[PDB]
Swiss-Prot record, chains A, B, C:
Lineage, broadest ranks: Bacteria, Pseudomonadati, Pseudomonadota, Gammaproteobacteria, Pseudomonadales
Protein name, per record: Probable M18 family aminopeptidase 2
Pfam families: Peptidase_M18 (PF02127)
GO cellular component: cytoplasm
Xref: NCBIfam families: PRK02813.1
Length: 425, 425, 425
């Protein structure tokens, strides 16, 4: 059922307010399915038929199904996605006290659209690092309830509001979380300490640092007269993580299947744990002999880089090429850009397109208007052929994005077919 | 305590997506409390101690509680508010069919902030006028389900989105409600016919015209670390309708109490339907003898004109006068403006300020900055002394506004004291 | 003594006018301390307790102390800095003869602030490549004495000078080094030939090419009423090279310690010998077995990326976030940017912050104002966890920068503690 898949997506989104939580949610499903967690510090002893996963920074995840045939001779079938989404992150000395409020200073992470973050019931989640019994450790928190808001200024006090103004992030985006009594101090670290106790039963000696993201408490939901759509934060790109996961868990065949979901894509993938890092490469090498084996394996592999595409928006149709306007619910989009903003080529495109035909999934094509500006990055790190595809969406980088409610099922089906395909060379 | 009043506010907002629904929700409460509906076409026979309400256009409502002393000799204690809120309304020939979608053309009603309407799960409600069995009639509909969305354009296709642009309402605000099959015709009036059957069991011969408002399906909610806040559409001015109602229904004493909630305030009033139409005057005259009575009664009356004020916003604090920055949860604000943008005067202010003190409710003062730019309308109709007050809020005319969670109780308390107050200035 | 450390810094800066000289100065201290130079062309035979260093391009240096425990099981403790600083470099056909002067045409290297280069007594140093007895070779030169000046134009001939104008580098930055007699030719290569003889006793057959940087002859100096400050060119980032070196040479414990100081950071680190090159990676791999060993080692390692931070400047305080304005002499700054302009995360931040606490060194936090723009690069090359820290400074990329005179000692102490720390996983 599309309906079961879509509900599964809504659940996953709800459990995944930050890249740490997305990674943990992926890990829980994998383990329930029998996948064994490996640690990058240990020597591994994997084998044919094994089901494994590994993480790095608790925010990037690689899932591995080793097939019957070795990667050396049959290659890997890889699906790539990303765990991060543009949002607001709490600063390290964040307490702002003004006009009787307590606010938290925020950085903008990734290319967020600012306006939609206003007038939303926000909570806060992510990683907290602390010392307990002279031991340094980390946990995830999620306050869950709506503790914050970034309100708009009344139109009465900003009469040209609808003219547009340059929203200044330093000044306009700090959320209000509380009011302070006369002479009441404010200690955010103390609030985190309370949350650690409440959520984990832990008392910290001291809260040191954290990576906390504001997020919307409004769950994702089906929308539309005929339930055509799905609305929710983080569709870019938890939509693809979830699809890629369902495809891996249900895939037939006995190929070598990889699900790589990396952090830091919204920011250029350049970290210890991003796609422009050697995470993927160092995991794959561990599944092969030394020498030429990795190079040979990779030239028999294909990466399907799954990241949301732009549907043609009816109130802004002129932002698309008239020949390449994807329809929501018209299936996955093959993304082409010969300037290598996407890595797709005629062979990767052709293979995917054929795969969609054999699976009876509709398929679409996108290029940008020629007067407008992980695929290329991972191709360039490990050298693997890549097709960039995505489900068509609107309002990418909003706090609440829109996709087609038929498209997840289309994508799970074709990814399932990819992962089961014994042929690529 | 009044988690009770707040939950009742949340419930009332949910049942009141349009002015028509707000009027119906007010009426259902008043009837539950014993108030009898009069009709403006009939001669009335009212009496001492009687509890009455009347409507006009099904969108404005006046509730009347007649005390023991005649209006002539003890005046009226009036509380004024309004039933309308800025929003988006369906055009009369609305169907727009483009890039495989069905959209509905919309007018902007009142001074709406455009941006917040984007990326929200919208439903649709209001009055439908139709012919059934040869006769003309009206019903309210509320689809309830989230059938519509106005999505943002991806930041990738609008890269200076955050620098601001002038949102064009004709082009960017039509909501998407569906996708159409190739050759599939779109008929909105037919969709209304189905909603009429579904919601009222009525089948129409022909659906003629309607006044339908899009609205947000996310309910109002308490927000903030210590539940300091309430967030929701239509606080302006359903917050005051609800407060006034509660005060009227619970007030002690013996006085002649009026609750006047008019439509069309957000567009200057100036319909048949108020507040500088003659609805209020024509109802009040009917409670008195002919002659000098109305004029005498009105000179012994006071109107407390309740409409939301602007709290000082900490991310935009220079938009207030530093001496006149109301705090959420700081209590009702007395609104002062010498150019009669508010009708408050030293006597109506002083009396209200005194009422708050005796009720132990905190009270605040607002004037605008002297370099920046309902009470006056109704004082100027009828001639009544007026104090303009309001609970302090943020983001007024957004789709989701913010108030203090303590302020509703504060307001109900003082309005109750006003209604029970045997003398005035 | 802070005083001995600071004098050591002043000496090191004086000996290090170019990245080649910085590298040579580091190498001389290391050798005096018993570190043995390895050559990247040779097979290495290193062992526990060994003290080694290697260079690449004579401008990047890696210093290695092998501990008792193998890197495989205890990881590396790495401190990263850079040998290069923004400056002016002589062009390859540089002789400009105009109005009786001889000038040298210059490129701007890195993001130099132009104005401060004017009206300074400059000398010239760096690498010269030549042929002597049919053999190609390189030496360093340093003219030492003040042979050049870039004078300002008199304010009298540029009366709006203080209004600001766009200093054109091609036209305004060539330094004057001499006056030419009527019909005297000018041969810069010949001058270099003389300098080779004078400085090294070498006669070249022909001077081919060179990488020569102008530099300030004014030594670094303590400044301030209470000697609070240190002023000098190249604090960014010879300040960190020097600190990192002192910490390595004095470190207790028996961990695996690395000091990586790379060239070309001011320009994006993208060279044979920069941090975006494989220098570091290829050295570290040589200290480990083949296979998974390097990956495992790296996931037990931590990089402390030490590069100067911005103190809050009292004449420009609004360029900082009010909550994150580091004080000179307030200790090292932990640099955070969730967009990965720094690689620090809650774990690397927390570990460093704790390390400062156990060492009794004050520690500070920096993020940028949210409306403003080697760590991430090396994390992304080798995959290592990284904390970006820096001593707070002013006037970065001037010819004369300012730091706190207490801060070097603070940084040496904490780096010493890092290098001696047996725990990170
Ligand atoms: Zn994406
Ligand atoms: Zn994105
Ligand atoms: Zn209002
Ligand atoms: Zn209004
Ligand atoms: Zn630097
Ligand atoms: Zn620099």
């Amino acid at each position: 059922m599309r309906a079961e898949l879509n509900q599964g997506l809504i659940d996953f989104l709800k459990a995944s307010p930050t890249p740490f939580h997305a990674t943990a949610s992926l890990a829980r499903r994998l383990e329930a399915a029998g996948y064994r967690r490996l640690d990058e510090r240990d020597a591994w002893h994997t084998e044919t038929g094994g089901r494994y996963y590994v993480t790095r920074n608790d925010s990037s995840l690689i899932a591995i199904r080793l097939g019957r045939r070795s990667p050396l001779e049959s290659g890997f079938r890889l699906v790539g996605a990303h765990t991060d989404s543009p949002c607001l992150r709490v600063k390290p000395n964040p307490e702002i006290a003004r006009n009787g409020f307590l606010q938290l200073g925020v950085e903008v992470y990734g290319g967020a659209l600012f306006a939609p973050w206003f007038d939303r019931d926000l909570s806060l989640a992510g990683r907290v690092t602390f010392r307990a019994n002279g031991k340094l450790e980390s946990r995830l928190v999620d306050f869950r309830k709506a503790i914050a808001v970034i309100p708009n200024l009344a139109i009465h006090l900003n009469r040209a509001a609808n003219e547009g103004w340059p929203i200044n992030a330093q000044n306009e985006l700090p959320p209000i979380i509380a009011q302070l009594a006369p002479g009441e101090a404010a200690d955010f670290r103390l609030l985190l300490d309370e949350q650690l106790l409440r959520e984990h039963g832990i008392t910290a000696d001291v809260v040191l640092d954290y990576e906390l993201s504001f997020y919307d408490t409004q769950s994702a939901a089906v929308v539309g007269l005929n339930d055509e759509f799905i609305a929710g934060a983080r569709l870019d790109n938890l939509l693809s993580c979830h699809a890629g996961l369902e495809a891996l868990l249900n895939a037939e065949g006995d190929e070598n299947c990889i699900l790589v979901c990396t952090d830091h894509e919204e920011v250029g993938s350049c970290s210890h744990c991003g796609a422009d890092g050697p995470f993927l490469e160092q995991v794959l090498r561990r599944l092969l002999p030394e020498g030429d084996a990795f190079s040979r394996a990779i030239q028999r592999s294909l990466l399907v880089s799954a990241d949301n595409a732009h549907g043609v928006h009816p109130n802004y149709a002129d932002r698309h090429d008239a020949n390449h306007g994807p329809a929501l619910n018209g299936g996955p989009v093959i993304k082409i850009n010969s300037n290598q903003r996407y890595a797709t080529n005629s062979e990767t495109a052709g293979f995917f397109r054929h795969l969609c035909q054999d699976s009876e999934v509709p398929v679409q094509s996108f290029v940008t208007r020629s007067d407008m500006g992980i695929g290329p990055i991972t191709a360039s790190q490990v050298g693997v052929r890549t097709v960039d595809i995505g489900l068509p969406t609107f309002a990418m980088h909003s706090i609440r994005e829109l996709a087609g409610s038929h498209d997840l099922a289309h994508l799970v089906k074709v990814l399932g077919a990819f992962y089961a395909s014994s042929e690529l060379p």
